[PDB]
């Protein structure tokens, strides 16, 4: 029949029990400090950390020197140090369990442009990313959840077409200028 794929998976897990003060306040603190839109995308990063920790624990259950354990452990550690959430000298499966969601939230492009001073606040950072003002290497990114690697950490910069790098001021600037010259010849 059809040549589709229909391979898809959910990226978040809802909490087992709702309406609990501690989890609600922690999640709201994370959202407010990191400028997230809703609770779904803090549950998403929690799910990502949970899957990584499950893989780490499963590998730790395997016997040492097992080639499958070694191969998957080095692959997982390499990915963890590429995304920058783990220290380069911390190449052990035990340290993977000690990582936190705050480590993953810090590597987001939205937090990164705020840390680099390109934005005045985290919400300014998000709205600045969404409007195609931020570029990585050469590609422009409008996705706040863009996880930035260590090699791509240095290459975050304003978009050339944006009215903060190259020229071409926005529509309101041009409208104000033409109104000013029309009122004042």
């Amino acid at each position: 029949p059809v040549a589709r794929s229909w391979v898809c998976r959910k990226t978040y897990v809802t909490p087992r029990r709702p309406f609990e003060k501690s989890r609600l306040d922690q999640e709201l603190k994370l959202i407010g400090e990191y400028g997230l839109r809703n609770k779904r995308e803090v549950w998403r990063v929690k799910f990502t950390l949970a899957k990584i920790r499950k893989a780490a624990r499963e590998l730790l259950t395997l016997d040492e020197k097992d080639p499958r354990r070694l191969f998957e452990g080095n692959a997982l550690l390499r990915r963890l140090v590429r995304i920058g959430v783990l220290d380069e000298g911390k190449m052990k499966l035990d340290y993977i369990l000690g990582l936190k969601i705050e480590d993953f939230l810090e590597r987001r492009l939205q937090t990164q442009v705020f840390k680099l001073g390109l934005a005045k606040s985290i919400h300014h950072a998000r709205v600045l990313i969404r409007q195609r003002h931020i570029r990585v290497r050469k590609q422009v990114v409008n996705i706040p959840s863009f996880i930035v690697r260590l090699d791509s950490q240095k290459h975050i910069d304003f978009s050339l077409r944006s009215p903060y790098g190259g020229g071409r001021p926005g529509r309101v600037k041009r409208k104000n200028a033409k109104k000013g010259q029309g009122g004042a010849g």
């Binding site: 029949p1 059809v2 040549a3 794929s5 080639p67 070694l70 191969f71 080095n74």
Partner: protein, 262 residues
């Protein structure tokens, strides 16, 4: 069904064909020929996804119908002709020759050979019987049969068939200590030397193979192609010499190659 199937779904195609999932719903469905469809390489995918000489089935059809594709010294216009194991693909207009040999991962690789080496071809005999008038007969691993062979040649040995004549020029006996190649199962595409053959009457004989690195394995007797007299192969081996290396020493080779290229 009420008869033979003449379709082949894309996902049910053999894995070593390396077909994807999004281009279509169907697979080439190779025609009947010298080789089973499970371990054959129809010329459409060979000329479209290995060589990229064509972009679609229609372009490879135009390529074939201009009479440039030569298999075993004969021009084959069948777009879905089952090429199969170690049949020489000759393209005279661009002047290169291909020997179809499994790689280290058990897939047909793009192996280029010289024209003087392309003139001959190894064949594994499958059965030897005597026909009418007491005339001996010999059947290869292909569908090719030849009369009047050497009486020394026995079952599942290897013979040297030269093209444009179809005759036997030399043979290699299936003996312990001869270089072989596995043509089925998990050990597909692995080059090694015959070390032991334990035979089970009423079942499948099992033969043991050790490669140059010293890694020993075993496989069924039906999945072995003797390729060399002792240790020197009679064919040009592909990249890696058919030595299956594990992922641990594959990853660091990739890293070293990237560091050299970077």
């Amino acid at each position: 069904a009420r008869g033979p199937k003449k379709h082949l779904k894309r996902v049910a195609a053999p894995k070593h064909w390396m077909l994807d999932k999004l281009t279509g719903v169907f697979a080439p469905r190779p025609s009947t020929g010298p080789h089973k469809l499970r371990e054959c390489l129809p010329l459409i995918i060979f000329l479209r996804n290995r060589l990229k000489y064509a972009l679609t089935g229609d372009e490879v059809k135009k390529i074939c119908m201009q009479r440039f594709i030569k298999i075993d010294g004969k021009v084959r216009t069948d777009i879905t002709y089952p090429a199969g194991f170690m049949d020489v693909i000759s393209i005279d207009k661009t002047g290169e020759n291909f020997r179809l040999i499994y790689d280290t991962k058990g897939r047909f690789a793009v192996h280029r050979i010289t024209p003087e080496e392309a003139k001959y071809k190894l064949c594994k005999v499958r059965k030897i019987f005597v026909g009418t008038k007491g005339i001996p007969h010999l059947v290869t691993h292909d569908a090719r049969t030849i009369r009047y062979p050497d009486p020394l040649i026995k079952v599942n040995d290897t013979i040297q068939i030269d093209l444009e004549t179809g005759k036997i020029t030399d043979f290699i006996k299936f003996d312990t200590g001869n270089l072989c190649m596995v043509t089925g199962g998990a050990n597909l595409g692995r080059i090694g030397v015959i070390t032991n053959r334990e035979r089970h009457p009423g079942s499948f004989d099992v033969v043991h193979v050790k490669d140059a690195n010293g890694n020993s394995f075993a496989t069924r007797l039906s999945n072995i192609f003797v390729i060399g007299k002792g240790n020197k192969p009679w064919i040009s081996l592909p990249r890696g010499k058919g030595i299956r290396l594990t992922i641990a020493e594959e990853r660091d080779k990739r890293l070293a190659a990237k560091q050299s290229s970077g």
